[PDB]
Write a protein that binds this ligand. Structure first.
Ligand code: SF4
Ligand code: SF4
Ligand code: SF4
Ligand code: SF4
Ligand code: FES
Ligand code: MG
Ligand code: MG
Ligand code: MG
Length: 571
């Protein structure tokens, strides 16, 4: 093929779109509704318009290059069209960036600036009740910002295959929303937030827990614990212009102190707890030659997928609480026992890459004696915003350490944030428990990385066992619907709702589609976790010295008795 673009000749055998070809050859073409290799097929944004001689204006993002094409990306006709489309969007957009939670990284604002576009008639709604939906424990919709670009609908379809996010017709007006305009929680929605990550604007957001947290921090009698997820320390630096793949563990700890939190713990300690419990459960099932498979139960997106689509699997879930809830339960029981705090005054906050964690933390039965396991959950984004509002100079902060009693973690806990992390961590402990040894080969590289469905055969004490790692909620559906689950007896299966694992959660920093072209965000975020695992002296959960003291002195034997009554949960 011979293609001419902006007067430049290319000879190529590529079968691809004008947009992709252009960007591979450093020619600028704007795009808005194109993401995840699809665009909005029914009301195309046309922001990727280019001129093809002999044809006229075409959308670059979904038009294949053809021998003979002469393309202009920057003619007057092209810029007037794009500008016009942006102006029409401004007519349905409450353009007030000051207070807007996307002010610093909005794709639309950038386009508005780029083409110097203006509304024909400013949109200034007087009743946002109509436009805002805050019923969900995890997601919020603000339709005054919604461009009807369809990226959330497409992202939900590709990432989950639930299509819980849909276009809806509301008396002649098109909106997005859940089935029948219900609260998302009341539908098959997983509450994973992949739709938020796909949104170019402030139209979708996490349900804020920031007021919960600030009220608690300012309440004199509340002792506010905070603990962050594995993924936050690999991610939050992005939002302070530190670049990608930066380990900021120590800066976070210092930042949390400066925000006024009273105790700095770490959910990776909770991850080591989950393993203590679940690896023990796996050995029990192995000893009792059943029941199989056991599924992980740490990802609440997957738990909702099971509840909504495979309720017959709920009995197969490990009864170990997730790192978050297990940690939270311990923070109301063990931690008062070693600190003297009145348990009612402990307020336990997590920092999560995840929107679905807010739903999990607010589950009615996730409490004991009237005390919630977890009182508040803020996303990575929310924490970033709290830090910025407090004017903490995050990139400049010095490293500090977590408080050790519920803050130490092993390398096994550290890699939880990546797909295959839980599997690898659990196998490190299950192999030791079952064989009563302290094995040296602990790296299970076969369960790592971005393949959608990953499997491995593992030897545990003279028998072969089959494990699987399902990476993405859409891959759960594939694994089940294709009957892959029936090709062999599976013994232990990890499921994560977000492809890449939690490092790609719905609570994570947005990344500009351009940067996504440069960086594999899933791999670069995960790399921080695996690097920690490599450089930690303890790389097995049951080697965590703080955790071991906690079990010796308070919980007893994992997976039975007290530990089973307190730290487990069945759906
Ligand atoms: S979504 Fe973007 S353009 Fe719209 S008000 Fe917020 S920052 Fe401004
Ligand atoms: S909520 Fe966001 S991604 Fe979904 S259609 Fe509106 S602007 Fe696009
Ligand atoms: S939270 Fe997940 S399942 Fe629900 S609409 Fe968004 S992408 Fe779909
Ligand atoms: S994979 Fe992690 S971030 Fe995604 S829904 Fe599950 S727990 Fe949340
Ligand atoms: S980016 Fe091509 S039609 Fe929207
Ligand atoms: Mg298309
Ligand atoms: Mg306080
Ligand atoms: Mg059990």
């Amino acid at each position: 093929k011979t293609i001419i673009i902006n007067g430049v000749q290319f000879n190529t055998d590529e079968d691809t779109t004008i947009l992709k070809f252009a960007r591979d050859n450093n020619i600028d073409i704007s795009a808005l509704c194109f993401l995840n290799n699809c665009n909005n097929d029914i009301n195309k944004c046309e922001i990727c318009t280019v001129e093809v001689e002999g044809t006229g204006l075409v959308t670059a993002c979904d038009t294949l290059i053809e021998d003979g094409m002469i393309i202009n990306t920057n003619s007057d006709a092209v810029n007037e069209k794009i500008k016009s489309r942006i102006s029409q969007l401004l007519d349905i957009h409450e353009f007030k960036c000051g207070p807007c939670n996307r002010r610093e990284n909005c794709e639309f604002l950038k386009l508005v600036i780029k083409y110097k576009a203006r509304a024909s008639k400013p949109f200034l709604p007087k009743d946002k009740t109509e436009y805002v939906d805050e019923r969900s424990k995890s997601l919020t919709v603000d339709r005054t910002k919604c461009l009807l670009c369809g990226r959330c609908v497409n992202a939900c379809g590709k990432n989950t295959e639930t299509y819980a996010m849909k276009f809806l017709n509301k008396n002649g007006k098109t909106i997005i929303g859940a089935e029948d305009e219900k609260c998302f929680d009341d539908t098959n929605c997983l509450l994973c937030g992949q739709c938020i990550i796909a949104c170019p604007v402030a139209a979708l957001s996490e349900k804020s827990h920031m007021d919960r947290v600030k009220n608690a921090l300012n309440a004199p009698e509340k002792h506010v614990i905070v603990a962050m997820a594995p993924s936050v320390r690999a991610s939050i630096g992005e939002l302070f212009n530190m670049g990608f793949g930066v380990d900021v563990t120590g800066k976070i700890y210092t930042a949390l102190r400066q925000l006024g939190f009273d105790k700095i713990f770490d959910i990776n300690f909770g991850a080591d707890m989950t393993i203590m419990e679940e690896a023990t459960e796996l050995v029990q099932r192995i000893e009792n030659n059943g029941p199989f498979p056991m599924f992980t139960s740490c990802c609440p997106g997957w738990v909702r997928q099971a509840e909504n689509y495979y309720p017959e699997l709920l009995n197969n879930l490990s009864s170990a609480k997730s790192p978050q809830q297990i940690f939270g339960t311990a923070s109301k029981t063990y931690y008062p026992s070693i600190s003297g705090l009145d348990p009612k005054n402990v307020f336990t906050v997590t920092v999560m890459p995840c929107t679905s964690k807010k739903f999990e933390a607010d589950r009615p039965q996730m409490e004991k004696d009237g005390l919630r396991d977890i009182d508040a959950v803020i996303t990575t984004r929310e924490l970033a915003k709290m830090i910025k509002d407090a004017k903490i100079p995050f990139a400049k902060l010095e490293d500090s350490e977590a408080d050790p009693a519920m803050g130490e973690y092993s390398g096994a806990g550290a890699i939880f944030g990546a797909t295959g992390g839980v599997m690898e961590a659990a196998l490190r402990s299950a192999k030791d428990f079952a064989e009563n040894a302290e094995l040296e080969d602990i790296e299970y590289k076969q369960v790592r990385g971005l393949n959608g469905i990953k499997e491995a055969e593992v030897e545990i004490n003279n028998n072969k066992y089959n494990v699987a790692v399902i990476n993405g909620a859409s891959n759960l559906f594939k694994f089940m619907k294709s009957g892959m689950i029936n090709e062999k007896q599976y013994h232990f299966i990890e499921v994560m709702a977000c492809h890449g694992g939690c490092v790609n959660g719905g609570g994570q920093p947005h990344v500009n589609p351009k940067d996504l072209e440069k960086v594999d965000i899933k791999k670069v975020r995960a790399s921080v976790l695996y690097n920690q695992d490599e450089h930690l002296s303890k790389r097995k959960s049951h080697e965590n010295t703080a955790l071991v003291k906690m079990y010796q002195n308070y919980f007893g034997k994992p997976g039975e008795g007290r530990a089973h009554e307190i730290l487990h949960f069945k759906y």
